[PDB]
Ligand code: HEM
């Protein structure tokens with residue numbers, strides 16, 4: 001069928017677009033190149049061809065077959081932040097990836113997914129008898145660093161459980177994400193002028209060295225113990241695999257890291273966006289308290305409830321459709337294929353633009369936020385906010401539980417207030433790797449007024 005996209009200019013074809021992704025910020029570059037040519041087109045990030053796609057048919061095809069379970073990015077960047085064939089999020093060695101994902105997939109379901117909905121209510125509960133840590137003088141709570149703090153402590157007590165410094169680590173993880181986000185597609189010339197990037201290369205070793213402290217401890221607690229099988233946790237499952245011949249110590253440490261940053265990065269920023277949507281929508285928030293009062297009143301939160309909370313479930317989705325945090329997924333092709341009647345060579349990078357695709361396709365009212373787009377049981381072949389298949393979101397299940405938990409235990413106890421004329425559409429956002437709010441502005445603060 002032959003391929004859309006800007007003219008290849010004999011040397012300049014790539015050089016514009018790549019540069020454009022650089023000055024624009026990945027997120028918007030796709031959101032741009034997708035409107036200029038089709039919902040299926042081609043650009044050049046580095047040498048290699050790269051397809052940027054939003055047609056739900058193409059989407060589905062890619063996430064579904066196995067020959068697409070790999071991502072991409074500057075080898076030197078991934079090398080610099082630690083994920084060059086070591087993590088999972090961006091681990092690209094399909095055998096080495098395949099042998100690790102098990103461990104994540106394991107601890108983010110089944111036994112520990114029942115323990116989550118109760119450790120999630122615990123960490124947020126304890127940090128709410130402690131607003132003295134996040135509130136202005138004029139009573140403004142810095143919501144983000146509240147979430148980031150509890151989200152990480154949730155992550156700790158579930159997967160690692162080692163006494164740590166909450167406040168200190170939260171920033172370091174934030175400095176890490178910065179770097180990750182910078183060096184991901186910085187073309188190889190970048191990496192030569194060192195007085196341009198050790199900038200980041202130090203705030204990496206900053207977090208990395210700070211975690212090596214924790215796992216050194218978690219290791220000793222293992223080798224002097226009250227009989228092993230008692231208490232299996234994502235940490236130990238790994239360190240034990242290492243104490244066989246299954247895993248590099250180098251590789252463990254990056255996984256234990258990829259696990260603690262995982263929730264803070266993504267959850268906090270999503271729950272921020274929800275908390276702003278609740279404030280700006282007065283009637284929606286009622287429906288959620290009604291649903292709460294009905295199913296729970298003033299009982300403790302417990303596992304069995306989360307299916308019954310159907311309205312809030314609906315909310316969480318509609319936020320994620322309308323206001324994504326992750327709006328593009330990067331995959332790579334490993335075998336050649338015809339996809340949507342198109343020829344795709346192996347080694348082509350794919351950027352699936354799921355954030356646009358959510359406004360282009362199935363939904364009744366794509367451009368306004370309403371719980372209406374979710375009165376009609378949704379296909380999941382049309383609304384794919386986590387992904388699926390062999391390399392979809394490893395958390396996707398435990399994720400939707402945490403949100404349900406923290407969203408409830410918090411909306412239980414406080415009415416929320418935006419600041420002035422601020423809505424989620426009037427905040428100012430970076431749009432590079434993810435789509436997250438810009439923290440070089442102010443007005444990202446909120447006011448918590450009690451209930452009953
Ligand atoms: C609610 C917030 C979250 C969103 C919006 C989200 C979404 C995504 C998406 C779109 C991907 C790309 C996978 C694909 O190609 O389909 C992904 C991957 C991944 N997610 Fe999440 N996720 C969330 C929460 C979490 C949590 C809480 C964890 C860990 C506790 C997590 C762990 C991971 C990991 C480890 C990967 C890489 C999987 C792999 O390729 O090996 N995610 N997530």
Ligand SMILES: CCC#CCO[C@@H]1C[C@@H]2[C@H](CC[C@]3(C)C(=O)CC[C@@H]23)[C@@]2(C)C=CC(=O)C=C12
Pocket residue numbers: 071089177261262263265266269325326328329330331433434435436
């Ligand atoms: C701080 C703002 C943010 C964020 C979340 O997005 C980040 C970046 C995500 C990554 C998963 C794979 C994604 C979706 C891509 O292929 C392109 C961007 C990638 C993800 C979701 C997984 C765990 C993690 O810890 C942080 C993130």
